[PDB]
Amino acid sequence: NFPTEYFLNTTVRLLEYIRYRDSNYTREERIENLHYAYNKAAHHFAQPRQQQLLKVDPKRLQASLQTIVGMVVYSWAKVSKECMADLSIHYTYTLVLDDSKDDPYPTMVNYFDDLQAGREQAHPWWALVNEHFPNVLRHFGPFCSLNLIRSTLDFFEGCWIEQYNFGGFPGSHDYPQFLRRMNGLGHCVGASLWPKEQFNERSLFLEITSAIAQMENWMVWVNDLMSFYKEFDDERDQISLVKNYVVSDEISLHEALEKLTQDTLHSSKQMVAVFSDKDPQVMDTIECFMHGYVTWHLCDRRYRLSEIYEKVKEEKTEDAQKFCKFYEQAANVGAVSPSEWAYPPVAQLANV
Amino acid sequence: NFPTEYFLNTTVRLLEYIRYRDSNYTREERIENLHYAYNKAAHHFAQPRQQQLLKVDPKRLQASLQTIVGMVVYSWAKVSKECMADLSIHYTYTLVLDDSKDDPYPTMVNYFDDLQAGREQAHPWWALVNEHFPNVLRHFGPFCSLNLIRSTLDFFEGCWIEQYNFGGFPGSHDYPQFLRRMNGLGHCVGASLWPKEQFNERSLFLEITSAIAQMENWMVWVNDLMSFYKEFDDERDQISLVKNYVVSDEISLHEALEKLTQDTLHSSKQMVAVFSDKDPQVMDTIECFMHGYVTWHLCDRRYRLSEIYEKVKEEKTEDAQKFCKFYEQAANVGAVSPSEWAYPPVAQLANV
Numbered sequence: 112n113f114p115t116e117y118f119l120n121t122t123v124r125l126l127e128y129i130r131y132r133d134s135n136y137t138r139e140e141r142i143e144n145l146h147y148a149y150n151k152a153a154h155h156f157a158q159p160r161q162q163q164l165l166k167v168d169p170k171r172l173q174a175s176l177q178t179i180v181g182m183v184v185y186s187w188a189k190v191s192k193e194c195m196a197d198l199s200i201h202y203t204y205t206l207v208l209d210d211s212k213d214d215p216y217p218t219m220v221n222y223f224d225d226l227q228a229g230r231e232q233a234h235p236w237w238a239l240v241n242e243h244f245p246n247v248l249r250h251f252g253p254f255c256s257l258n259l260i261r262s263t264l265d266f267f268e269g270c271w272i273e274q275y276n277f278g279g280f281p282g283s284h285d286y287p288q289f290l291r292r293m294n295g296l297g298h299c300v301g302a303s304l305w306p307k308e309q310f311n312e313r314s315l316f317l318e319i320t321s322a323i324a325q326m327e328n329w330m331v332w333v334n335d336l337m338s339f340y341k342e343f344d345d346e347r348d349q350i351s352l353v354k355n356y357v358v359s360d361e362i363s364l365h366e367a368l369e370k371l372t373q374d375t376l377h378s379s380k381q382m383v384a385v386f387s388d389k390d391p392q393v394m395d396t397i398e399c400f401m402h403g404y405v406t407w408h409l410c411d412r413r414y415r416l417s418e419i420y421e422k423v424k425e426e427k428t429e430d431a432q433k434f435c436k437f438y439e440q441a442a443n444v445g446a447v448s449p450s451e452w453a454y455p456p457v458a459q460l461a462n463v
Numbered sequence: 464n465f466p467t468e469y470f471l472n473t474t475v476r477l478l479e480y481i482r483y484r485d486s487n488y489t490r491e492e493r494i495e496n497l498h499y500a501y502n503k504a505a506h507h508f509a510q511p512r513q514q515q516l517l518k519v520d521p522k523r524l525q526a527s528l529q530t531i532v533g534m535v536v537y538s539w540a541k542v543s544k545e546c547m548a549d550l551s552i553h554y555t556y557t558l559v560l561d562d563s564k565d566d567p568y569p570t571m572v573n574y575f576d577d578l579q580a581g582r583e584q585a586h587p588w589w590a591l592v593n594e595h596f597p598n599v600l601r602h603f604g605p606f607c608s609l610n611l612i613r614s615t616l617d618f619f620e621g622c623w624i625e626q627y628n629f630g631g632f633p634g635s636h637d638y639p640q641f642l643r644r645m646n647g648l649g650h651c652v653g654a655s656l657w658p659k660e661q662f663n664e665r666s667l668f669l670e671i672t673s674a675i676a677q678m679e680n681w682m683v684w685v686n687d688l689m690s691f692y693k694e695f696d697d698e699r700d701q702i703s704l705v706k707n708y709v710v711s712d713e714i715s716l717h718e719a720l721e722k723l724t725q726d727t728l729h730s731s732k733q734m735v736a737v738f739s740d741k742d743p744q745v746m747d748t749i750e751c752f753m754h755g756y757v758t759w760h761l762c763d764r765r766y767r768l769s770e771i772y773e774k775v776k777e778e779k780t781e782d783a784q785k786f787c788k789f790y791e792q793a794a795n796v797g798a799v800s801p802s803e804w805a806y807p808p809v810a811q812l813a814n815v
């Protein structure tokens with residue numbers, strides 16, 4: 112019984128308030144990048160070693176690779192082409208784990224010993240991610256790298272904790288954000304926004320650190336919101352910030368939703384206050400990520416918000432009128448045919 | 464300036480909530496443990512490798528190791544002697560890194576590659592800490608270990624950031640929590656309260672995870688609260704959670720203090736509220752930690768809370784007397800002369 116209606120009352124405030132307006136790229140640029148990124152990642156995930164260690168249903172690997180290339184490209188609009196590709200590999204790995212089961216425990220028992228000795232991790236995921244990492248890290252200075260590493264690590268714990276579908280003992284007010292922060296790849300996204308070929312870690316240490324701290328919550332709440340739909344009646348997505356707010360904080364799915372919104376709205380207000388007068392170049396990237404990020408949410412299959420445009424394309428509310436007005440802008444700019452960039456299929460590359 | 468009355472009220476409330484009371488920890492036992500831990504550690508830090516790779520003025524090392532042994536022994540009341548010893552070494556390392564003013568950049572440049580390769584780290588602090596870690600992790604299961612490994616890493620970055628003496632951009636509301644969390648060592652503390660020889664993560668996963676989640680905030684805010692007296696006039700330490708709230712949030716020092724207190728009390732309440740009915744054995748570890756922690760704050764000279772007792776030992780106010788009650792209780796069990804356990808000095812062990 113997805114609340115609907117109210118969903119719009121939320122989405123609209125956010126979009127209207129952040130003055131949603133994806134302006135980055137040109138149809139003739141957007142595709143150049145979608146294809147470049149998809150091409151490298153797909154060639155990578157098609158190798159035998161990757162194919163044999165990453166346990167993923169071919170179909171899901173493909174859908175994920177596409178949702179990721181879409182995310183990297185639409186949000187990291189100011190980084191190099193190579194950078195998007197390598198980021199797309201790293202984020203495609205994390206998405207595989209985010210949607211998977213399997214118990215880590217058995218393989219994580221000698222984690223730190225194998226680490227300190229230089230011995231491939233028992234867990235296949237760690238074995239492939241740690242092997243690939245260097246191709247992501249080369250694009251960054253040391254500090255931003257630490258952030259990427261830590262975050263990827265935290266995210267690993269989060270997925271683990273998530274495998275107990277636990278929303279927290281009622282009255283464990285802290286639990287909710289504790290868990291969301293742990294699996295939101297906050298510091299990983301925020302730091303990967305600053306390639307060294309384009310930024311000087313030491314010269315912009317303060318702005319970059321501030322961006323990591325602030326963007327962590329914006330980035331995650333916006334997703335907690337936009338994807339409230341697709342994560343509604345799905346297992347594994349059963350445990351979400353909103354849903355755990357209810358359990359742990361003891362309130363109604365209606366209030367928890369208002370909570371997430373009042374927050375998201377504030378994060379947004381402070382992003383601007385803080386980064387407006389600062390280095391134009393920084394603002395530009397934050398700006399592009401924020402708009403591009405929303406464009407992707409209103410366009411990728413994963414979040415399937417189409418099943419809402421075509422479910423309210425009728426209800427003439429001053430609310431669902433704005434929602435649809437927005438959804439339109441989005442697809443208009445970011446709705447592309449996979450037939451123009453996502454090819455050939457990863458599988459087809461694998462059996463060669 | 465200085466809310467002597469307001470502080471007292473908040474302190475008594477916090478002590479009340481957590482039920483600050485009579486431990487079953489006998490003063491003769493406290494001394495057994497204080498000496499055991501101090502001894503293994505002093506012998507460790509007196510090793511030559513340690514002696515030449517750890518840059519710390521001998522007197523501060525001596526003092527630091529002592530403050531730590533006290534903190535551990537008085538708070539990890541239910542763990543074995545070896546456990547207290549090994550945690551005492553790891554926590555002394557961390558505390559010692561704040562004395563370092565050296566830029567992590569040059570040594571962090573090849574962090575990930577040396578790591579993945581199994582080559583000794585460039586930054587000496589890492590070389591020692593990572594080499595000693597097994598000595599600590601062996602006391603815990605895999606889950607709990609991951610947590611320690613992560614916090615220590617987050618800790619390293621926080622030190623890095625703190626080197627910039629930056630309290631946050633005005634309006635960057637998410638910065639103080641971000642930073643305090645970065646170097647709070649929360650998930651480390653929380654996860655180190657459950658040795659595998661006494662608990663089973665698999666069976667108590669949700670209880671443990673939840674503790675980590677709530678303890679992270681409790682432990683850091685309670686420390687920020689007790690430290691609020693010594694740091695009040697400390698022009699040296701410019702960036703403290705509260706002082707950052709002042710700058711980042713743009714509020715009066717008093718308003719920020721008001722913020723900490725609310726979070727601290729509320730955090731305390733929810734602690735009990737959530738763990739009273741839970742496994743008895745677990746609530747004991749929690750219940751005891753909170754008490755010794757406070758006992759330690761009340762007893763370690765570094766916080767100079769005795770200066771307060773010396774200024775309200777006669778007022779006939781309910782708060783003022785309640786305070787003294789608790790203090791004399793703590794002094795009763797905790798006030799122990801260093802001569803009784805901390806010997807011989809590390810310096811003397813080093814020449815031998």
Ligand SMILES: CC[N+](CC)(CC)Cc1ccccc1
Nearest residue numbers: 205206209295296300331334
């Ligand atoms: C990158 C962070 N994200 C983006 C939608 C929001 C918290 C979740 C995510 C996790 C794992 C793979 C892809 C996306």
Ligand SMILES: [Mg+2]
Nearest residue numbers: 209210294295
């Ligand atoms: Mg996830």
Ligand SMILES: [Mg+2]
Nearest residue numbers: 209210347348
């Ligand atoms: Mg998910």
Ligand SMILES: [Mg+2]
Nearest residue numbers: 334335338342
């Ligand atoms: Mg979500």
